[PDB]
């Protein structure tokens, strides 16, 4: 969980193709970048997550 600071997709050549979705999360303790599975892009737009939005992501 944390405040979203970036939602930059990671473009790549397929062996536009994305291989990861980097989400930056900020908390009062600090900031962390997560190399999430690309499929999470559907849920991000479904939830309308934007920079400066507080979110939480369950591991499972």
């Amino acid at each position: 969980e944390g405040e979203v600071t970036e939602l930059t997709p990671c473009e790549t050549e397929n062996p536009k193709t994305i291989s990861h979705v980097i989400i930056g999360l900020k908390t009062a303790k600090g900031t962390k970048q997560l190399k999430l599975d690309p499929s999470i892009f559907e849920s991000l737009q479904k939830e309308r997550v934007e920079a400066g939005d507080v979110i939480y992501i369950e591991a499972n």
């Binding site: 790549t12 050549e13 062996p15 291989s19 190399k35």
Partner: protein, 49 residues
């Protein structure tokens, strides 16, 4: 071609993530904090129980 490209890409990704971790390590070797808020400096008293 897919069989060869998949392995070549997996290696490229391993290399790219290692370079990213190295860049993060370099960024963390740099000083993290140099300033703190005015409220913490004067508007509060530090206590311990």
């Amino acid at each position: 071609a897919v069989m060869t490209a998949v392995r070549a890409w997996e290696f490229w990704n391993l290399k790219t993530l290692q370079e990213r971790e190295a860049r993060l390590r370099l960024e963390q070797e740099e000083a993290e904090l140099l300033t703190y808020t005015r409220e913490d400096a004067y508007s509060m008293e530090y206590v311990y129980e």
